[PDB]
Amino acid sequence: NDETKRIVWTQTAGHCELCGTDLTFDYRAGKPMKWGEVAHILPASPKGPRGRADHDAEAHTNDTANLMLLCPGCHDKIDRDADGYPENDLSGLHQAYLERIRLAATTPDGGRAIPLIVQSQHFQTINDIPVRDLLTAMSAEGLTAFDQGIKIAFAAPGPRGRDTTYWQNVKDSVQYELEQQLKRRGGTYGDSPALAVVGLADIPALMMLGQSIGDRSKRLIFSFHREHLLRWPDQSAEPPSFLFTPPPNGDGPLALVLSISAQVPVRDVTDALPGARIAELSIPEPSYAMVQNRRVIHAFRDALQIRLSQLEALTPDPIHVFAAIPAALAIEFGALLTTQHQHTYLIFDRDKENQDRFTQTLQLGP
Amino acid sequence: FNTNDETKRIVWTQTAGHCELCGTDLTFDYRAGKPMKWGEVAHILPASPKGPDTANLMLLCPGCHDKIDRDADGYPENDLSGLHQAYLERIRLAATTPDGGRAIPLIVQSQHFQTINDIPVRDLLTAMSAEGLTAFDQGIKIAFAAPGPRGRDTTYWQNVKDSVQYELEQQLKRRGGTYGDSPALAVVGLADIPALMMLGQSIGDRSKRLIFSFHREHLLRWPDQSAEPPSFLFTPPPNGDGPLALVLSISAQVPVRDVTDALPGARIAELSIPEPSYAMVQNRRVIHAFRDALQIRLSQLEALTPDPIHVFAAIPAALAIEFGALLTTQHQHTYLIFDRDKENQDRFTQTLQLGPV
Amino acid sequence: NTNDETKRIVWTQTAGHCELCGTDLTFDYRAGKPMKWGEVAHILPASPTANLMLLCPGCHDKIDRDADGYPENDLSGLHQAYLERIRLAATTPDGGRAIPLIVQSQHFQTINDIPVRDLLTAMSAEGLTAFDQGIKIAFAAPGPRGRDTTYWQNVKDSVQYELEQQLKRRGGTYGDSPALAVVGLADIPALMMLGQSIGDRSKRLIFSFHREHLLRWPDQSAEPPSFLFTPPPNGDGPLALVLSISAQVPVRDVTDALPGARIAELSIPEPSYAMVQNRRVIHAFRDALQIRLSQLEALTPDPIHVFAAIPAALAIEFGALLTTQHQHTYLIFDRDKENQDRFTQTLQLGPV
Amino acid sequence: FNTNDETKRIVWTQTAGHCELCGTDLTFDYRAGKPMKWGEVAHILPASPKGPRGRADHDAEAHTNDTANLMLLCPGCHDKIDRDADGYPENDLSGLHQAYLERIRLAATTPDGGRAIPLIVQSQHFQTINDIPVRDLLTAMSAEGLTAFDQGIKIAFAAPGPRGRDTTYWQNVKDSVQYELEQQLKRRGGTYGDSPALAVVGLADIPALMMLGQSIGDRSKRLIFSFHREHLLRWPDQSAEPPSFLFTPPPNGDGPLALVLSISAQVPVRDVTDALPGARIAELSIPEPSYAMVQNRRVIHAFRDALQIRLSQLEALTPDPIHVFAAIPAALAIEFGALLTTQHQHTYLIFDRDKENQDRFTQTLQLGP
Ligand SMILES: Nc1nc2c(ncn2[C@@H]2O[C@@H]3COP(=O)(O)O[C@@H]4[C@H](O)[C@@H](COP(=O)(O)O[C@H]3[C@H]2O)O[C@H]4n2cnc3c(N)ncnc32)c(=O)[nH]1
Ligand SMILES: Nc1nc2c(ncn2[C@@H]2O[C@@H]3COP(=O)(O)O[C@@H]4[C@H](O)[C@@H](COP(=O)(O)O[C@H]3[C@H]2O)O[C@H]4n2cnc3c(N)ncnc32)c(=O)[nH]1
Ligand SMILES: Nc1nc2c(ncn2[C@@H]2O[C@@H]3COP(=O)(O)O[C@@H]4[C@H](O)[C@@H](COP(=O)(O)O[C@H]3[C@H]2O)O[C@H]4n2cnc3c(N)ncnc32)c(=O)[nH]1
Ligand SMILES: Nc1nc2c(ncn2[C@@H]2O[C@@H]3COP(=O)(O)O[C@@H]4[C@H](O)[C@@H](COP(=O)(O)O[C@H]3[C@H]2O)O[C@H]4n2cnc3c(N)ncnc32)c(=O)[nH]1
Ligand SMILES: [Mg+2]
Ligand SMILES: [Mg+2]
Ligand SMILES: [Mg+2]
Ligand SMILES: [Mg+2]
Ligand SMILES: [Mg+2]
Ligand SMILES: [Zn+2]
Ligand SMILES: [Zn+2]
Ligand SMILES: [Zn+2]
Ligand SMILES: [Zn+2]
């Protein structure tokens, strides 16, 4: 009936459940118009597409679970290739679509924030965080934005690897490009904008990023995850214990090893920094997947805050960092150095141009 | 504040029929069973006070409409335009979610399996569609290049990788959707394990990418989405100074003797599942679980020695792709990948080196 | 050696033309005769449905000389090259993805509001297709500092911010950024900054608000007027460029504002507010203007003082022209509604 | 009153099975993979005068099978034009309709001209967006019979940092031209062949385009295209005659030898002497320096011919390097660079306008051995 059709239009918000197009407006010529169709998953005729002689059309005809709002072209397609769009497939997509709309309508407003994606090109594969997945994880926490945000992609390493020019580009990406793009947004978000930031880039560059947004109010760190993408793996998980080994007595450069994503072999630290006094922060079971929720990041921040103070009093010389940590925790490491820790930190990193030996990269200081 | 019919239909639709202040579904009377009295169940109020369009018309239930202080002309006394727009933006994001499924189909096989079990694009497209992944052009169907007289050497494998990445980087240029994102990659492989690990090496694991797994019975559809991942049991390597060898007994139990045969003095560590099997990839979480368990142990093994880890794997094709994609960080430990030679009595031989020399 | 389904696919994918000589094979329908698909053309494997070609009877006689149903030479390269050409043409409509941009001063936004609907229908007529809501901007009013360098730099940042956030929305067949369809209605200096913001090195199409035709082009067939240049007088006074395009600027009002000005001038025979007859008029104004600015820029290193009576679209293009790496100093003057419409300096472009 | 099947089959054919308004392919469903016709034959003028765009003076019986009145549309583009007759008037649609059919016919009747690698090189040193559309290059290529196996290479230089176009910037440029570009051309190798033709269009730093040309002039089968402020990638005028290129020779002396190119604009001699005191200026120009002067590729050939021998001459006149001050379009900067690949083995110091130093010419790249 006309009432059920109006309900199909309402609960779908007038978009095609299969492609997402807005069926309430014509953006080419600018006229509000209803150009959608209410499609039947199960046909009245059991000889039609997805027709089953063992089906009660007396009930499903008005069941909002048998009725999808589809643009004209998607309806043509599901009805002309029933083998390719079986009932089970379409009913699944149908309920999932309605759920996301309900969840969006019932999410309490949490405020505004600037989406910020920072990604490098130093991997030997594509490295691309989808903007949509960051905006979706923000929206699940009530956060919205006026624009799709800032997305900074570092220049790729040249023929000499990650050389001086490369690390200069990184500095210009963090300290100049990001600043300019944030300044261009002042008139819109104001002078107290929250930063919804996710990063997947060189560890030293994420630390530098963190230090340059560390004095920013309302910093929400998100995380790219190999299984869950921008979704938090498990909101109910407990942070691990961040085990700490203080460094041994003596002179020699003080090295801070962080074994969070993996166990950093001591033999690689002393190879690069002979005579190193190794202090180590680790978790019981190092793992790439350990960033289960933001409380894990806060817990890492809390544990590191205390150890950096201890180490900064155990030496007058720079602290040499050898880190195997997730990206989100590299940002947070850097954020601790913005005003709370003014000691000098020299960041070593794996060097593909040197058989995976650690070599010095950026220096982070006051 | 009064409005016309078309105006209310637009406000109800663009709000999904919920109160923008408390999120209550104002289609309640419909779900109960009573006829819908759209007019009495909700007050459509402008979002902003009077200050000298349907985008600034809100939908409020009567409760919230009575709590909002209004002036005599029906406008809100305080400015609700910020929450109104936020609420609309959250609905748009959800309603546009289907276009976040733009995807590239990728089928990679060996010249052999393209003659044996040639996977058709249609099998992948329907499995993709089922999960909301929507191709927009012909899929990429690739066959690994047969080796010339130089063989499968470093240059050969570098040309495979180069060839696979060229092919998809051109399709990843085809940005689209609401925000201009690159499409997702939907990939399935069927080739020898080393060649599959090179597929993972080419694609990585730092993008929106969904692996699929060929299965004769289900084709590229998941056998059982509800199945829980199996436990991945680990036997630590023995003490000694011999070459370190990681054995993966996932599809089957690799005879220890076959490993010692190909690698004299091999200290064997082994990840395995309680009941190895060819059909253990019941869904995608199985693949993720394998990655997590594997990397936890590779962390332990790489720290044991600077010398190469020798890999002897009886693992499903999908897991061989993920294994290759795992080892695409900047950090690289030397891995020497062994494969059974079907032309010489299934003896393990060294096919592929990964990482430093 | 083909079934009706295959012939239909080959006929559609090729647009009914012979893949070797390009003669139209739908001629029967065109003249008025019944369409005999299988008599006017032959389908043939390209090498000795994606690998079948459509050939006219003649070309078939020249390829299949042994009438064995296959060619004597591998024609796969020409066949596939042919289908690509067809595909690029058939998908050209998606090359029109576009962003509506309406930029007005707060004054014109109230007295002469341009509706998005007017721009969109002008765009659609030319094959430009918006996919989301249009951008509608109003120039922010200054503060007590007035229109200092900071004000104009902030106008530019806010315009570029919104502009670049929508140029991220790539799409179509090749992931191209969408085209910018922009119309402006504001004071001349503020329109020059809109031009400084958008540039002229991207797929961008200016539209023009016309007092009579609104955002539609008065006469797509109109030829552009000749642009007339009076070189400046010899001397050592400040250099001025008067643009009398929509009206004659009185030389006395230039010198009153710029004592001792050596006035060069660009104009048209019949200055008129309605002269923006089509987009070719805007292009022709740029070409003439740049040819003379090159002359004027080579005269002196000192700035060029600009007094312009020009349509709004020509003010944007003026601004867009001056976005190369090279930058001569220009001091743009505009009539102050407070000071009896006296030309005042309002905007500086380029070096101090 | 109802279009017949013969005419519907004609509409499908003359449109190659795509929507004349959005370009979607209406012969296949790429999501599930099944070939299918899902396009509709839409009528611009309806049989009923009350229909969308209905006219009373319209002889319906004499246009139901008139392909000039029938478009192939996707189901959604059909709902829209019939639900907003005012926003899709008869003349708008009719024009879009005939233009579509014309592009199809020009394609179908273009003689093949072999393959080429599409190549776009653009910088980010302007204060505005700078983006050459990929489709416009491919359409320019197709117009000359050239097709490609992929959409080609598109190289966007790193933007200048906070210090302007400093040493880091030009190192990035060199890396983009000499390393990244070579890398991408290698990976394509095998899809095109040993020595394929290049369809190259550039819009980047004048010194970078010269370096680009030098790196590819040794390559054979270079087809240069040009971005034009009015015509985009379409050649402004294929019939226009090349301009007269005017060469003023340098005076004998000891000053440094400067080559001034006044083509897009007149380079002031003050700015050359400011940066290079006592320069000996040899200038190549045209009667009316203009940004729009790249009317066709013959203009580019004529600029090449006008300096191919001049550079040899100038090289003998001085042992020191030749100092270049060029106001030229982006396509001639690529051509200038190609001339220097090996034909002219000599050091060339390329000066360019420095936004940091108040538009003064300052040295940037060095080109030669
Ligand atoms: N296994 C191991 N890794 C070591 C060792 N010494 C240094 N490392 C480095 O630690 C990082 C571990 O990877 P991650 O995924 O946990 O975190 C990285 C890191 O925050 C950032 C940059 O990556 P990279 O330069 O490879 O640093 C990698 C390793 O070299 O990005 C994160 N990241 C990279 N890829 C992903 C991804 N797919 N998803 C999420 N985050 C990612 C050592 O001894 N052993
Ligand atoms: N039982 C057993 N297998 C061993 C042992 N040592 C090594 N192997 C190898 O493990 C693989 C197990 O087969 P799979 O189907 O689980 O996975 C294969 C593999 O990922 C890839 C190539 O196959 P192959 O070279 O035979 O490697 C096979 C075995 O030799 O493709 C997968 N694959 C092959 N055929 C199919 C198929 N029909 N369907 C799905 N996946 C397939 C050892 O000791 N024992
Ligand atoms: N007659 C005359 N005009 C002079 C003189 N010195 C300066 N001017 C300015 O030239 C412009 C002429 O009007 P226009 O419509 O051709 O162009 C204006 C201009 O581009 C922009 C802002 O308007 P304004 O600040 O008045 O500049 C007006 C004049 O002051 O907007 C354009 N514009 C204004 N109204 C409309 C409209 N209704 N439709 C289209 N464009 C409009 C001088 O000596 N003499
Ligand atoms: N007017 C003028 N320009 C001078 C002078 N001395 C040096 N120049 C430089 O010459 C070029 C003139 O502009 P163009 O468009 O004719 O050529 C440029 C050039 O080939 C390349 C990079 O631009 P840029 O670094 O600004 O060089 C500009 C100028 O600084 O790209 C070309 N280019 C730039 N913008 C476009 C565009 N929109 N469309 C097409 N090509 C473009 C001097 O005295 N006067
Ligand atoms: Mg149906
Ligand atoms: Mg239909
Ligand atoms: Mg023959
Ligand atoms: Mg119709
Ligand atoms: Mg329809
Ligand atoms: Zn749809
Ligand atoms: Zn409420
Ligand atoms: Zn022919
Ligand atoms: Zn369409």
Side-chain angles (χ1 to χ4, degrees), chain A residues 27-29 147 149 184-185, chain C residues 117 124 129 161 164-165 168:
Chain A
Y27 290 102
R28 172 169 180 158
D147 55 78
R184 253 163 55 196
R185 266 171 189 77
Chain C
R117 164 80 164 177
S124 182
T129 68
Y161 154 69
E164 300 185 358
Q165 290 305 116
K168 285 168 166 184

Side-chain angles (χ1 to χ4, degrees), chain C residues 18-23 25 55-60:
Chain C
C18 170
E19 301 193 38
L20 278 174
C21 70
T23 48
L25 311 182
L55 290 181
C56 73
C59 282
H60 183 287

Side-chain angles (χ1 to χ4, degrees), chain D residues 19-24 26 73-78:
Chain D
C19 180
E20 305 187 26
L21 288 175
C22 72
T24 309
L26 301 160
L73 296 181
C74 70
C77 286
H78 199 176

Side-chain angles (χ1 to χ4, degrees), chain A residues 33-46 48-52:
Chain A
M33 63 175 71
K34 196 178 111 156
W35 62 283
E37 309 179 338
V38 169
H40 282 109
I41 302 176
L42 292 170
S45 176
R50 291 165 292 273
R52 323 194 278 91

Side-chain angles (χ1 to χ4, degrees), chain D residues 82-157:
Chain D
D82 285 357
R83 288 165 214 208
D84 184 0
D86 288 341
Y88 298 95
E90 151 178 23
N91 316 96
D92 290 6
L93 297 176
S94 186
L96 297 165
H97 176 35
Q98 302 299 339
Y100 186 85
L101 300 182
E102 185 57 17
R103 288 193 219 85
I104 292 289
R105 280 190 294 270
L106 300 163
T109 66
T110 294
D112 169 58
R115 304 289 174 179
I117 304 170
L119 173 59
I120 294 170
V121 181
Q122 61 196 40
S123 69
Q124 307 188 69
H125 80 287
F126 307 95
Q127 313 295 345
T128 74
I129 293 299
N130 180 40
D131 203 14
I132 303 172
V134 168
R135 173 179 286 279
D136 286 72
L137 173 60
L138 300 176
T139 296
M141 294 171 56
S142 176
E144 300 179 4
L146 309 166
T147 59
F149 298 97
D150 63 299
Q151 75 176 249
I153 296 168
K154 183 162 179 178
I155 289 177
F157 299 152

Side-chain angles (χ1 to χ4, degrees), chain A residues 25-31 33 146-151 180-181 183-185 188-189, chain C residues 117 120-121 124-125 127-133 154 157-158 160-161 164-165 168-169:
Chain A
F25 196 79
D26 172 12
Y27 290 102
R28 172 169 180 158
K31 182 185 182 179
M33 63 175 71
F146 300 112
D147 55 78
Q148 69 170 254
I150 298 171
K151 188 152 171 195
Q180 300 271 87
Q181 284 201 237
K183 157 165 183 56
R184 253 163 55 196
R185 266 171 189 77
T188 297
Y189 292 86
Chain C
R117 164 80 164 177
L120 289 173
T121 58
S124 182
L128 297 173
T129 68
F131 51 85
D132 203 333
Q133 203 79 238
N154 288 329
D157 291 336
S158 66
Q160 292 188 321
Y161 154 69
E164 300 185 358
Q165 290 305 116
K168 285 168 166 184
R169 311 184 62 176

Side-chain angles (χ1 to χ4, degrees), chain C residues 116-257:
Chain C
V116 181
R117 164 80 164 177
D118 284 356
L119 180 61
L120 289 173
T121 58
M123 293 166 51
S124 182
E126 303 187 358
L128 297 173
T129 68
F131 51 85
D132 203 333
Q133 203 79 238
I135 302 175
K136 193 139 158 48
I137 299 170
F139 286 107
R145 298 296 170 202
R147 308 219 276 191
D148 59 6
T149 43
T150 293
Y151 170 85
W152 288 124
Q153 255 295 323
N154 288 329
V155 170
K156 197 192 199 174
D157 291 336
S158 66
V159 166
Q160 292 188 321
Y161 154 69
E162 307 226 29
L163 172 54
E164 300 185 358
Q165 290 305 116
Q166 291 285 304
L167 299 178
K168 285 168 166 184
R169 311 184 62 176
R170 301 172 162 278
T173 308
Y174 306 107
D176 277 333
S177 279
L180 177 64
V182 55
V183 62
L185 189 62
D187 46 293
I188 284 168
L191 287 175
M192 300 186 77
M193 284 303 310
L194 172 62
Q196 293 267 296
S197 302
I198 67 183
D200 52 9
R201 50 193 57 82
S202 54
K203 185 168 170 154
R204 171 267 280 172
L205 300 97
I206 298 178
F207 289 77
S208 187
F209 178 82
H210 202 263
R211 286 165 168 86
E212 177 181 350
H213 297 94
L214 274 46
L215 300 195
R216 307 215 57 163
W217 295 116
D219 183 353
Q220 290 282 60
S221 76
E223 295 299 329
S226 293
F227 289 87
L228 312 171
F229 179 73
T230 281
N234 259 281
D236 50 62
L239 185 63
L241 172 62
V242 174
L243 309 184
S244 297
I245 303 291
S246 48
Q248 255 286 1
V249 180
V251 295
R252 318 303 178 194
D253 290 356
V254 176
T255 58
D256 287 332

